[PDB]
From a paper:
[name]-X was predominantly found in OFS in NaCl buffer and iOFS in NMDG, NaCl/glutamate, and KCl buffers. In contrast to iOFS-Na+, OFS-Na+ shows wide-open HP2 and a fully solvent-exposed substrate-binding site. R447 interacts with Y373, already in place for glutamate coordination. In contrast, in OFS-Apo and OFS-Na+, E374 is buried and proximal to G415. It is likely protonated with pKa-s of 9.2, 10.0, and 7.6 for OFS-ApoK, OFS-ApoNMDG, and OFS-Na+, respectively. In contrast, OFS-Na+ and OFS-Apo feature fully open HP2-s, and only transmitter binding can close the gate. hEAAT3g in the IFS, bound to Na+ ions or apo, also pictures an open HP2. Na+ ions bind with high affinity to OFS-Apo, and OFS-Na+ might be the resting state in cells under physiologic conditions. The neurotransmitter and Na2 bind to OFS-Na+, promoting HP2 closure and transition into iOFS*-Glu and IFS-Glu.
Human excitatory amino acid transporters (EAATs) concentrate the neurotransmitter glutamate and aspartate in cells. By coupling the uptake of one substrate molecule to movements of five ions—symport of three sodium (Na+) ions and a proton and countertransport of one potassium (K+) ion—EAATs ensure that the cytoplasmic glutamate concentration is ~10 mM, which is required for neuronal functions, while the extracellular concentrations are as low as a few nM permitting rounds of synaptic signaling. EAATs are homotrimers composed of promoters that work independently. TMs 1, 2, 4, and 5 of each protomer comprise the scaffold domain mediating trimerization; TMs 3, 6, 7, and 8 and helical hairpins (HPs) 1 and 2 form the substrate-binding transport domain.
Numbering used by the authors:
A (entry chain A), B (entry chain C), C (entry chain B): 14 to 168, 199 to 476
Write the structure that this text describes.
Amino acid sequence: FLKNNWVLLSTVAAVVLGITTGVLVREHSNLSTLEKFYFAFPGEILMRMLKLIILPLIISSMITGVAALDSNVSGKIGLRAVVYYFATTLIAVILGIVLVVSIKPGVTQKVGEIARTGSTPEVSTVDAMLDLIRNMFPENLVQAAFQQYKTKREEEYKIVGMYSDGINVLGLIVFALVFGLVIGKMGEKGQILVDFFNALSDATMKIVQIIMWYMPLGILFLIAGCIIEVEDWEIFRKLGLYMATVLTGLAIHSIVILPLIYFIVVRKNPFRFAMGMAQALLTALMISSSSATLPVTFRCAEENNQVDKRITRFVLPVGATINMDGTALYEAVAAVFIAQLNDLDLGIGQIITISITATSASIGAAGVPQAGLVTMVIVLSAVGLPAEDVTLIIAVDCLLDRFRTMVNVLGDAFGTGIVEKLSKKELEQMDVS
Amino acid sequence: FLKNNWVLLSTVAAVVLGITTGVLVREHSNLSTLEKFYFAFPGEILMRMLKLIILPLIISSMITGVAALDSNVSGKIGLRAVVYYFATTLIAVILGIVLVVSIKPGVTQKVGEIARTGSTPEVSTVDAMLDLIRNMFPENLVQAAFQQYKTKREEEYKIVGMYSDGINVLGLIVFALVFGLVIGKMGEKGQILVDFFNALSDATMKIVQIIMWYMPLGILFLIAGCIIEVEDWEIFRKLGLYMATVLTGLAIHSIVILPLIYFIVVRKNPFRFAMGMAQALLTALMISSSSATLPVTFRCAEENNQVDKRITRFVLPVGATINMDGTALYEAVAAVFIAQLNDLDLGIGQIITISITATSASIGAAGVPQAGLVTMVIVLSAVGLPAEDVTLIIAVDCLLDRFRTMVNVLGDAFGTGIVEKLSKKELEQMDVS
Amino acid sequence: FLKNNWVLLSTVAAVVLGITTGVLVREHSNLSTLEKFYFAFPGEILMRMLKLIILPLIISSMITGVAALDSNVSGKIGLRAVVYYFATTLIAVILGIVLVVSIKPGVTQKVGEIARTGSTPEVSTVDAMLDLIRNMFPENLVQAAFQQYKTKREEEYKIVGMYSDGINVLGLIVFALVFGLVIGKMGEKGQILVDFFNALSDATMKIVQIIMWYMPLGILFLIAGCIIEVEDWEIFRKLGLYMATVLTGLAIHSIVILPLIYFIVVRKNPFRFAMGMAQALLTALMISSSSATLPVTFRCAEENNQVDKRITRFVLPVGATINMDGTALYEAVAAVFIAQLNDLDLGIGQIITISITATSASIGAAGVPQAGLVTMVIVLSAVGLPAEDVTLIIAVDCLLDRFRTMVNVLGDAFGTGIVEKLSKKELEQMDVS
Ligand code: NA
Ligand code: NA
Ligand code: NA
Ligand code: NA
Ligand code: NA
Ligand code: NA
């Protein structure tokens, strides 16, 4: 049985050992902040090693995937993927809103009882959306590989912009799509670039295979340091009903809505598809990042589920960037819970604008130093609530982010198969002629 | 008639509509600073899309152009282009000085009457020239793609340098020329690099062709927001004679001096050459940037005027970087006008040093966050005037910069044809053997 | 005799003329700080031109060298090189410690008599080593080409990290080694990348050949400005015995230890090997940088000593990065001298930990804005001395750094030949089959 499922067994054992070690250490010892930081060093090393891979993999994969297909086939496949992503995000938002409204978690809990943690950023909604469009079209290609643009209102007001660290994934993907479309039409004139980027993609995948050897040791310390950070369980008991509502929404979505759509589109049992993606699901639940787990999702979807490479290389990065089913559900539930916490009544129009803002904000927001907090503030402003109410939820974000990430990865994995089945005729036509 | 001149007709219609919209909006409505900024969003998007193209196009074009020619042919062509650029800049400076001296605009106008706008930077002349030489030879190739070097005097004085945003075009072009010279001599060993950069150049040109579709909508809002910014026309009336002198100099240069030299060198009617470049001229007059309009100039000069690609790819980027006929004329006229504004008499030696400083400063200065203001301050210091007198002219810089840009582009376009005619024998000899 | 040794003769003449000019200028004239800075402009230009070459040369050379060999041959060659580097650094540290202890320079000199210069940085040992491991694995490939990571302790303490300028050579070399290993195994799939990087390496070497023409003029002003900076010779007389001890250690190492090991391993006379590397030795003694002189060492070792390119391309960059025989000897001598300056007795265990800290700190530290000062502070903290005692030695660092650099380059040059002789069978086996 070994030498075939060694990676999965090692990951499971590392997760179990890390949970046990975190519980034992935190319970039977007292550590300072500096010692707690020093305890999680291998996890940080694994984090930066996985971050090192994102740029070459995304660029080469997008260019190769777009360049392989014809222009007409590419347009159709992209349209189907976009429609699927939008529909799934909207359904997730609707389910979240319905659940949080029905359960009514915030009615009993008082605002004064709940403690406050973290700091609230200052957000302008229009400036945030305009910054999103600006980052769609960067000014410098080299700067976009490690930096992003942001505008702030300053003084009777003037807008001033600056650049800060953090890779601009959206602009890079837009440019990679346009470049692959252009070099596909050149034919014999652009073949050398196609070969260059194909070789680069293969090399990056082999490097990821190398990193997979060290992954378990970093995973152990990552989950252990996640457990050690929480000082007390009283806040967890105080936020029990809200976390239960969020987890119920995520579980219902992942177990019912996506498998039902998959079975309706492609007449196959979706649980074998989910079993194929189990390794990527555990990776997403541990690392808690959708872009860093992309090569694992690539490998799972291609080797286990026998999905076509032409569909996968195109679909997976775009889904990793713009498909946020777990996030939008979270935002909606948190917004309505905060509204119920105060003595504020919610009308039908308020629910509608909350849903629209959550759907657009999650899809648009691909990466920001504080992306979730900014989008949560935007939703709260849309409903009219103060931005300072975000502090109430921050205590359990480190715990819920992992489940949100794994839900996003599951959505992308299901979507790749659905789009592959939808465009079965085009692939046959293209390969025969 | 359509489907052949659609781009030109759309650009003309967009310019007319933008002027009309700007006039109507500013006259029949009152807007705040924030609303004025929000009104020009499509123009800013077009700006950053055009800036995204500069780096790959310049690098690939320079490498391909130098690598195609032989070393001896390259040296001759470069020498002819450099001599033409220097001579045209010197003639422009002389014409400017003669005109501003003859008209005497500053005699009547009092210094106290003219209002003051903007902020005056602090400039050291020797430090500025040394920074120019430093930027000729950058320390890092990756950093030079999006940043530039500057030194300031601080304390009995010590020099401290730092890096700020803004692409270092001069250093990139120097390195690209050296690299293309080196890989041309390698022969069979460097062929793969030649193929790589040829394909990159073709892809970049196709991407520019894509951007040309959205250009008109951005142009409309660019010219409209340019018109809306000016608060009142009283300052325009107060600076009427100075603007008239500058426009007279630019028009005389563009209509007489360049066509005469072109007709003398190559026995052809230069107005058909200008008609071929009309699209690039309108692009430069709208965007007001010489580097961003380079692909349009490439396309016009190659498709319409049937200029050789070997000459064009070498000549156009260098001219875009170091040929500043419109700027030097502006600087000279502004300097002498400021001198006439005060009770200061100008001697022959003062005129000579003004002309020399304007010629060297404009040619050397290719790109700086505030390039024109810094060079104007340098010229004022050379004649001995205070740097605070720059504030008087800033009011109409946004209007005059477009005409200066279009004059620079026209000079480059004429120079490419003149150099092509001068080196007709070398091309034939190289292609036969 | 000319046209064959023109570069060497020009360099020697430039060194002599620069020493003469520096002595005459400083003695018969008085210059301000600004004028002293302006006097060394050509040297600074040569400095930045040599820095421009490091990134492409290192990346292409490492990728090409690793990709050429088989995986098993690569592992053996790397292991032999690593063992040689560690052994030579340890021997250098032991010799330094023995010499400084025997001579006893600090017994007579009082602490109060010695003047203090410069500023002492704040260093945390554990944070420094963790930063070294972090820089081994960077987060962004584009950012690693011009920036480095550093963590500081801030407030009951929290760790905050930031990025500052300075190329991350260690992370780039680790990635280049892994990439070359991966693309070597791909075979026919990775051939285009191999060709690309081979051509890039050849082009970079030709560009270095171009820079060699301007090198002498910059060297003259570099050595002249080095001489002019020192205000008085009294401090040199006060630090005479310490400088004599350091120079004795360096000379003994370079003349006895390395040639003896070379002769023992490969039965050849090592002084002809040293004569071959004379040009690189003078380059290192003038520029005082090990990475900037790497192409000169490449050319000397390949053309003059007939060393195999497969061994050289692999060995020389790693040695330039991690082989610091001169530095560790310096650190040990300085530490023990500072200890003798105070009324502090040194035990055997203290000597052992000093030697271990010097050996590990010099090898690990490849490049930092203040690398020597930080490692000296680390050693002083390891022995328990205050970090403020570093100010005593800074006066002669600009003089001693050149000798340290030339010792490092000599060690790398000897190591390449020793490793080539050790792995003679593998090369024959690989080329026959
Ligand atoms: Na979705
Ligand atoms: Na996703
Ligand atoms: Na000119
Ligand atoms: Na120009
Ligand atoms: Na060593
Ligand atoms: Na070295």
